[PDB]
């Protein structure tokens, strides 16, 4: 248990350092290959889908809605970089939320 | 003896685990692709019929951005090799020898 916990610490740190993966962090890559062999692709269609997944990476954002304007309903969406863009700022958008101990530059 | 940490009566309806293992990848894929299994990376590549290595390397350098360039390609190859048998190539082989 001791060693398994010390790795379970580094198994958190490397994850939050970004370049390390897990089951629901690579399960989408299992899905990538799944549908690439399901609905066949050509190379340039692959580059189009890759630019699609780079536009759904650093700007795609959650809380997507749809109409059934008479009736509308909204629920949350898959991850991105922009959900980090919004979780780094207390979800406030104003990066000066840390009113506590911090050095200042004037 | 039943090896260590290898669960016997593990199903697919049994919830998915978290450990990056060959067994874990293979069973998660069994859920995911339904029934596709490749005897190597290159069975998958003959199925994809013209998707080179870089053609997935760029896809994944995009998909997860904190990865570096060649590291995207590495995740590519590694998930292949882990749902397959590892590959016989002068790349891996010169890695082994030099190392």
């Amino acid at each position: 248990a001791v060693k398994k916990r010390v790795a379970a610490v580094q198994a958190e740190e490397a994850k939050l350092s970004g370049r390390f993966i897990t089951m629901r962090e690579a399960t989408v890559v299992l899905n990538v290959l799944a549908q690439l062999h399901r609905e066949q692709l050509t190379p340039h269609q692959v580059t189009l889908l890759a630019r699609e997944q780079h536009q759904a990476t650093e700007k795609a954002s959650g809380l997507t809605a749809t109409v059934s304007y008479q009736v509308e309903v909204k629920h949350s969406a898959r991850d991105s970089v922009r959900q980090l863009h919004e979780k780094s700022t207390d979800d406030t958008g104003s990066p000066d939320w840390y009113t506590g101990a911090s050095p200042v530059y004037n | 003896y039943v090896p260590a940490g290898h669960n016997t009566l593990s199903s697919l309806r049994h919830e998915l685990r978290l450990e990056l293992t060959a067994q874990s990848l293979k069973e998660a894929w069994m859920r995911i692709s339904g029934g596709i299994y490749f005897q190597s990376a290159d069975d998958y590549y003959a199925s994809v019929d013209g998707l080179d290595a870089e053609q997935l390397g760029e896809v994944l350098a995009a998909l997860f951005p904190y990865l570096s360039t060649y590291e995207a390609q590495a995740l590519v190859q590694c998930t292949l090799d882990s749902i397959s048998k590892p590959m016989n190539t002068a790349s891996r082989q010169l890695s082994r020898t030099i190392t």
């Binding site: 062999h37 | 029934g35 596709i36 299994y37």
Partner: peptide
């Protein structure tokens, strides 16, 4: 049972190559 594993998975691979032409063309 060993042959049963092998059968199940080869017929799943047959199904996959069937779904190939049936879904993309």
């Amino acid at each position: 049972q060993t042959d049963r594993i092998r059968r199940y998975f080869k017929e799943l691979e047959e199904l996959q190559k069937n779904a190939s032409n049936g879904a993309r063309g």
